[PDB]
Amino acid sequence: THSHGLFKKLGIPGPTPLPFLGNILSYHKGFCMFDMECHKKYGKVWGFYDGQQPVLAITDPDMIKTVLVKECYSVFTNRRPFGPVGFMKSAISIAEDEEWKRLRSLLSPTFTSGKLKEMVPIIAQYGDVLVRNLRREAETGKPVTLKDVFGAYSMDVITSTSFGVNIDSLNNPQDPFVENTKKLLRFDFLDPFFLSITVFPFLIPILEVLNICVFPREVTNFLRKSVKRMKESRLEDRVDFLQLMIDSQNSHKALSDLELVAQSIIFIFAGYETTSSVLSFIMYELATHPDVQQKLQEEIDAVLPNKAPPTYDTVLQMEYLDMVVNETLRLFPIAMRLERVCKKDVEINGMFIPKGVVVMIPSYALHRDPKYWTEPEKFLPERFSKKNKDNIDPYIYTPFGSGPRNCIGMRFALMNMKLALIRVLQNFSFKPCKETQIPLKLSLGGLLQPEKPVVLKVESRD
Amino acid sequence: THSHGLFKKLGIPGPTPLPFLGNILSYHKGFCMFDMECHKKYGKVWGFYDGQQPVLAITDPDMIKTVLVKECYSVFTNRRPFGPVGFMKSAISIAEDEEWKRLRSLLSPTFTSGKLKEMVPIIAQYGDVLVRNLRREAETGKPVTLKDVFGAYSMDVITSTSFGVNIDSLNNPQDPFVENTKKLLRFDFLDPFFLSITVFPFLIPILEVLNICVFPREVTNFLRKSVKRMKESRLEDRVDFLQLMIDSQNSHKALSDLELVAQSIIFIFAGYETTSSVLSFIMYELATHPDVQQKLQEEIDAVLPNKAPPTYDTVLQMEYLDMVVNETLRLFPIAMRLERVCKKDVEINGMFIPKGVVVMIPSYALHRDPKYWTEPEKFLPERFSKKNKDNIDPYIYTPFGSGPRNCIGMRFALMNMKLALIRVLQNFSFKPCKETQIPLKLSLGGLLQPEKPVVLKVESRD
Ligand code: HEM
Ligand code: HEM
Ligand SMILES: CC(C)N[C@@H](CSC[C@H](Cc1c[nH]c2ccccc12)NC(=O)OC(C)(C)C)C(=O)NCc1cccnc1
Numbered sequence: 001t002h003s004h005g006l007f008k009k010l011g012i013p014g015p016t017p018l019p020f021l022g023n024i025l026s027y028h029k030g031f032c033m034f035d036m037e038c039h040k041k042y043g044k045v046w047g048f049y050d051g052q053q054p055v056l057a058i059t060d061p062d063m064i065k066t067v068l069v070k071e072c073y074s075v076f077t078n079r080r081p082f083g084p085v086g087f088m089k090s091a092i093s094i095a096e097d098e099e100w101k102r103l104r105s106l107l108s109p110t111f112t113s114g115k116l117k118e119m120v121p122i123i124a125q126y127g128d129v130l131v132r133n134l135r136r137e138a139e140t141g142k143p144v145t146l147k148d149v150f151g152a153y154s155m156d157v158i159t160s161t162s163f164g165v166n167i168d169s170l171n172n173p174q175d176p177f178v179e180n181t182k183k184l185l186r187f188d189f190l191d192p193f194f195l196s197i198t199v200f201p202f203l204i205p206i207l208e209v210l211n212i213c214v215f216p217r218e219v220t221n222f223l224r225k226s227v228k229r230m231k232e233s234r235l236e237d238r239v240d241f242l243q244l245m246i247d248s249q250n251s252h253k254a255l256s257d258l259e260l261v262a263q264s265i266i267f268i269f270a271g272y273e274t275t276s277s278v279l280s281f282i283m284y285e286l287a288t289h290p291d292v293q294q295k296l297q298e299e300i301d302a303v304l305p306n307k308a309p310p311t312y313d314t315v316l317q318m319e320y321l322d323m324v325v326n327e328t329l330r331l332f333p334i335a336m337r338l339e340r341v342c343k344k345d346v347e348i349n350g351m352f353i354p355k356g357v358v359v360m361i362p363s364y365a366l367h368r369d370p371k372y373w374t375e376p377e378k379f380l381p382e383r384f385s386k387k388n389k390d391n392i393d394p395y396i397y398t399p400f401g402s403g404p405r406n407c408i409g410m411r412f413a414l415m416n417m418k419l420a421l422i423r424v425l426q427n428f429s430f431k432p433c434k435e436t437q438i439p440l441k442l443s444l445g446g447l448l449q450p451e452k453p454v455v456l457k458v459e460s461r462d
Numbered sequence: 463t464h465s466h467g468l469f470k471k472l473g474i475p476g477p478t479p480l481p482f483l484g485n486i487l488s489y490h491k492g493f494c495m496f497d498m499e500c501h502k503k504y505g506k507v508w509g510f511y512d513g514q515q516p517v518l519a520i521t522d523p524d525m526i527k528t529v530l531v532k533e534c535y536s537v538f539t540n541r542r543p544f545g546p547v548g549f550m551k552s553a554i555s556i557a558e559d560e561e562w563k564r565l566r567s568l569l570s571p572t573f574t575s576g577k578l579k580e581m582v583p584i585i586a587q588y589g590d591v592l593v594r595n596l597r598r599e600a601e602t603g604k605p606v607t608l609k610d611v612f613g614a615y616s617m618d619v620i621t622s623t624s625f626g627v628n629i630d631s632l633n634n635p636q637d638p639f640v641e642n643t644k645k646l647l648r649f650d651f652l653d654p655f656f657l658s659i660t661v662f663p664f665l666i667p668i669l670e671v672l673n674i675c676v677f678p679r680e681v682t683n684f685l686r687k688s689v690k691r692m693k694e695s696r697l698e699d700r701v702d703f704l705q706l707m708i709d710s711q712n713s714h715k716a717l718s719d720l721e722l723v724a725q726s727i728i729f730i731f732a733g734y735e736t737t738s739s740v741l742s743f744i745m746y747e748l749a750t751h752p753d754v755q756q757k758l759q760e761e762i763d764a765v766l767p768n769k770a771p772p773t774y775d776t777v778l779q780m781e782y783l784d785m786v787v788n789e790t791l792r793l794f795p796i797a798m799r800l801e802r803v804c805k806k807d808v809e810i811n812g813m814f815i816p817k818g819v820v821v822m823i824p825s826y827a828l829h830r831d832p833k834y835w836t837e838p839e840k841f842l843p844e845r846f847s848k849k850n851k852d853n854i855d856p857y858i859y860t861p862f863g864s865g866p867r868n869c870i871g872m873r874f875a876l877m878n879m880k881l882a883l884i885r886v887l888q889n890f891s892f893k894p895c896k897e898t899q900i901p902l903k904l905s906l907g908g909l910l911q912p913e914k915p916v917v918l919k920v921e922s923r924d
């Protein structure tokens with residue numbers, strides 16, 4: 001129908017599409033399973049149909065580089081639309097071409113190593129909070145649910161690093177400011193709503209004229225005014241994302257107020273469930289590989305004797321920790337794919353690409369390719385040792401993507417997660433319960449997350 | 463366009479419609495203002511257009527009777543659809559024709575005077591709760607917001623009379639069971655979403671296939687399982703609406719489980735903001751007419767000396783109280799209109815009515831008609847004295863509608879509100895603050911509710 005002959009014409013293999021649905025029935029096992037099977041069955045490039053929308057998959061690292069880096073500005077600048085977005089049209093990760101470029105320009109200085117070293121003390125205080133809450137659970141030998149305790153942690157670091165609000169969310173789960181922000185959850189792109197948006201993408205315009213949005217209209221409204229209060233209470237009466245944006249609107253064309261709110265929202269959205277999720281995947285591996293946990297506890301005490309508090313520089317000093325984080329990300333790259341919309345008829349690395357195709361890099365499946373990783377399913381942190389870390393193709397292992405449009409939040413995310421692990425492990429060990437799901441099964445959904453949530457035994461090194 | 467010549471053809475007056483919008487621009491001042499102006503300008507019958515949808519207004523009490531009573535089953539059985547409803551299609555107030563008739567049959571015995579006398583003791587306990595919360599506000603001379611304290615009250619009576627759950631919502635505003643139920647708020651039929659649904663009623667089918675609903679998909683999901691837990695904890699291990707429905711599914715065709723949940727939801731929806739709102743409108747009048755308040759306090763002590771607790775029968779004994787409630791409802795009939803969809807070409811009281819028209823009775827405007835009420839804007843409870851209560855046309859004063867499809871919840875609503883007022887006034891007097899809005903302005907919105915929320919001074923008769 002109307003475009004389902006495209007790949008068959010270019011000589012590109014793939015699963016044969018059904019009318020209207022294309023291949024979306026093949027998502028019944030999740031993006032991850034579909035992508036590995038496809039890589040296996042079909043080889044180095046393949047093609048499928050998200051309804052009428054042609055998606056070209058690629059796995060050659062040279063080709064990936066062209067797309068993510070070389071022709072990023074010229075050809076492959078934007079992501080694919082996904083549903084009605086309202087004013088969130090202005091958020092950097094949604095925006096396009098020159099508005100994107102301007103936004104990415106206007107926001108980059110907020111994510112430098114400099115500002116991040118200034119934020120480290122704030123992100124630290126809530127590690128202590130995390131500990132006392134964990135100790136409360138450990139002095140009462142009851143299995144712990146990480147996503148809850150790490151959620152409460154991530155939530156705290158966001159509320160602080162982005163607005164100055166200081167909440168113990170785990171113990172104030174019903175503060176107005178914690179309630180809204182806990183509704184900014186990762187979109188399930190295989191839930192009813194989003195699948196239909198894929199079979200009926202013409203519906204998106206209809207919703208937009210009805211001010212219906214995939215960002216709940218009330219959470220956005222709460223923050224828009226919460227910001228405009230903060231804005232006008234500091235102006236006038238250092239050191240969060242909001243103040244860094246306030247200072248910036250003092251490319252070009254400055255930052256509009258509505259533009260400012262939207263970024264603020266996308267930072268919470270980005271930083272809340274990801275931090276929570278990754279931190280849980282890591283504690284899962286640490287707990288099912290007690291040697292890796294011991295070796296990391298040993299490393300942490302070396303740098304920080306006497307449970308010394310971690311600093312920006314003592315954090316970047318810890319190599320095994322960096323290894324442990326990077327390998328967890330290999331097995332659970334929560335973005336799962338990267339995607340670029342081809343804006344022009346192009347030819348790259350010997351392959352014609354017609355305008356309008358979505359180019360997709362199947363991150364999860366490349367992270368578990370046996371042709372670039374030995375024993376890809378095993379959790380083996382040494383793959384990232386300063387010895388082996390050189391035989392790893394930065395276009396095969398892309399947990400934050402690559403190029404002008406990679407994750408702007410990368411250094412903060414990594415720092416935020418590491419500060420958590422250092423303080424937690426300084427004080428506790430983590431052990432399987434019987435109710436622990438070993439082996440952790442991944443969700444057949446549209447999200448990278450455990451089937452059953454991770455529950456563990458926490459014990460005090462006291 | 464496609465139907466805007468209808469009234470002009472039948473000789474029926476009304477405001478001239480614009481293409482596509484019909485007359486909806488005339489709602490800029492609210493349904494209430496539009497309806498009085500229309501009654502004034504145009505007389506005993508008029509016509510307008512909710513987009514393409516012809517609505518015929520009527521004010522002759524004989525004609526109203528035919529519509530609400532005589533030809534209710536034959537002709538005027540259903541209300542007008544309003545947006546996507548999901549499984550709430552099964553709720554009695556939404557359902558149609560034989561399913562309605564069956565539901566109204568299967569649910570009527572739950573609202574008898576018998577069951578209501580059995581519920582009175584439950585509804586009483588939360589009057590005491592209401593008092594201690596009020597006393598806490600009165601011992602701290604801070605103006606009170608009625609909708610909050612009455613909301614918390616109404617919320618408590620619902621949670622109890624419908625599931626057995628016993629919560630002090632005002633002090634547990636963050637119990638999971640109170641959180642969801644506080645989201646079941648009255649629909650604003652002049653908010654963006656519903657106006658568009660009126661200009662684009664073809665959009666309703668589109669939303670329905672997207673499982674988008676005007677009952678938030680999460681509140682419904684919470685209760686559906688909350689019920690199925692309650693259902694299977696009482697079955698097996700008297701005296702609420704849920705148990706009365708459980709007993710009924712033990713016309714005809716019994717009550718399906720999904721059918722049962724939906725009614726449960728519609729009862730909360732119905733009984734929460736209405737009780738809250740009416741109770742606030744009443745305290746407003748009592749507080750701005752201190753004689754009426756005194757006369758009612760005097761009456762209550764006569765029946766119930768020593769702050770005696772109210773009983774079902776001592777409640778029906780209080781005539782001035784019944785007067786005060788009924789007159790408040792005159793000035794603030796929160797339904798505002800009644801509506802019936804004409805299902806066949808008919809002729810009633812000398813007027814042809816073509817199939818598909820919505821027949822509408824402008825309750826608010828009839829309640830303030832100078833041709834049936836002297837000084838209609840004044841709050842004068844004596845209009846309802848056992849002397850004058852006979853010169854009041856039950857088809858002009860219809861705060862609960864009339865006929866086979868009037869409010870099934872009427873006796874409960876009235877009893878629930880009166881039990882509140884008796885206990886409250888036994889203990890407190892209510893006085894204007896400076897921040898009180900005198901005179902209360904009504905919302906220009908699609909709801910009957912105060913412009914500014916009612917704030918009063920509460921003082922202890924101790
Ligand atoms: C463990 C944590 C995180 C992971 C694994 C992650 C991963 C990713 C990935 C794969 C992308 C797409 C990059 C590409 O297209 O090549 C991305 C984009 C993005 N991330 Fe993250 N992310 C994380 C946390 C964060 C945080 C904390 C922020 C805070 C501001 C953030 C903000 C963004 C933004 C704004 C984009 C889009 C940038 C643009 O399109 O210009 N992310 N992230
Ligand atoms: C002060 C409180 C209330 C007022 C003023 C009120 C008013 C009304 C009005 C005007 C109608 C439409 C009747 C008609 O079309 O003629 C109605 C319908 C209805 N009410 Fe209420 N109501 C109140 C409280 C309640 C309560 C507590 C319940 C509890 C179950 C309830 C359940 C219903 C139902 C189910 C219908 C639709 C009945 C049907 O269509 O078969 N209402 N109400
Ligand atoms: C999908 C939500 C997160 N809307 C995005 C728009 S594009 C940023 C990217 C989304 C994405 C990556 N491959 C995809 C393949 C198909 C469809 C969408 C995507 N993000 C992403 O990794 O999200 C998680 C970890 C998958 C939840 C947005 O604006 N996200 C802010 C954000 C979120 C998370 C991390 N960093 C930034």
Ligand SMILES: CC(C)N[C@@H](CSC[C@H](Cc1c[nH]c2ccccc12)NC(=O)OC(C)(C)C)C(=O)NCc1cccnc1
Nearest residue numbers: 541555556648649728731732736796797798799800801869
């Ligand atoms: C509109 C909401 C309440 N959906 C109803 C469907 S029809 C019951 C009726 C609605 C109604 C009366 N004139 C109208 C004129 C135009 C459009 C709709 C209506 N109710 C009604 O009085 O609602 C309040 C007090 C106006 C909020 C529903 O199912 N409502 C359950 C319910 C609510 C309140 C009282 N009793 C029952």
